[PDB]
């Protein structure tokens, strides 16, 4: 049960840090961050439930990819805002591993894993985008 506990608890950490981070971004990035706090919920719901509860959709992950595609066109923490999301990126990375450790151990959480890995690459993009936006000013 340990890998489950780690997984979710570590997921709790991640979504909490986003909830702090969402206070330093524009309405647009807030509305994204608040969307992810949701999918992480569905993620922890699947996981706590060891698979009985349905998790996130495939449509959720296409959504991410869409975002990744959207931002790629335009030292952590060039800004405090930048630092926030970069901090969130490192958490994401560890959640991504602690969830990977869940899968190899049982065989639960495939989409989740994928969802989380795209997500840390997105967090990266966001941090670097505000870096750009404030440096463009």
């Amino acid at each position: 049960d340990d890998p489950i506990i780690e997984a979710n608890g570590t997921l709790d950490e991640l979504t909490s840090f986003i909830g702090e981070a969402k206070h330093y971004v524009d309405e647009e990035m807030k509305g994204i961050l608040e969307e992810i706090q949701n999918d992480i919920y569905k993620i922890m719901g699947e996981i706590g439930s060891k698979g009985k509860i349905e998790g996130i959709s495939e449509e959720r992950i296409k959504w991410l990819a869409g975002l990744i595609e959207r931002y790629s066109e335009m030292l952590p923490g060039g800004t405090l805002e930048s630092a926030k999301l970069d901090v969130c990126r490192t958490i994401a990375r560890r959640a991504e591993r602690k969830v990977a450790t869940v899968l190899r151990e049982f065989g639960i959480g495939t989409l989740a894993a994928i969802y989380l890995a795209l997500l840390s690459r997105l967090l990266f993009l966001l941090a670097r985008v505000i870096e750009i936006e404030k440096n463009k000013l």
Binding site: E58, E59, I61, A65, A100, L103, R104, T110
Partner: protein, 149 residues
């Protein structure tokens, strides 16, 4: 023969894909089956080489997800417990779907004995899922209703 059994199911699954391909009457399906046949060769190097060589990517896996969603949209609601069959087109894929879930099983087994990249299993699962989409759509475009258990 750790990864050996794994490779041999890749070659096994691969042949099945190219049978269902040659039966399909639709271009997006045949294209898909072919991208896969190729990605199976990659997948098969990732495992044979321990990852040292060509590797399964995220976009490879992302691509598969992009397509499932696009087809889930055409189908709609998927009631659970579909009796496999309907047409030769749809049937042949249920066969290939099966060997794909077998493949998954064979990758599961290997990991616990030799290092394997996750993307290998992640791709492997999405492939089974997507072969299920194929069978479905096939009957759909043929106006053939699935039986549910």
């Amino acid at each position: 023969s750790p990864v050996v059994e794994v490779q041999g199911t890749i070659d096994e699954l691969n042949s099945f894909i190219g049978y269902a391909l040659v039966l399909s009457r639709w271009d997006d399906i045949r294209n898909d089956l072919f991208r896969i046949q190729n990605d199976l060769f990659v997948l098969g190097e990732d495992v044979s080489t321990g990852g040292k060589g060509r590797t399964v990517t995220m976009d490879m896996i992302i691509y598969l997800i992009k397509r499932s969603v696009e087809m889930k949209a055409e189908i709609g609601k998927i009631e659970l417990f579909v009796v496999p069959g309907g047409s030769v087109e749809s049937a042949s894929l249920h066969m290939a779907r099966a060997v794909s879930r077998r493949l998954e099983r064979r990758i599961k087994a290997a990991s616990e004995l030799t290092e394997i990249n996750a993307n290998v299993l992640l791709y492997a699962n999405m492939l089974s899922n997507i072969l299920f989409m194929h069978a479905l759509i096939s009957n759909k475009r043929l106006n053939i209703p699935e039986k549910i258990w």
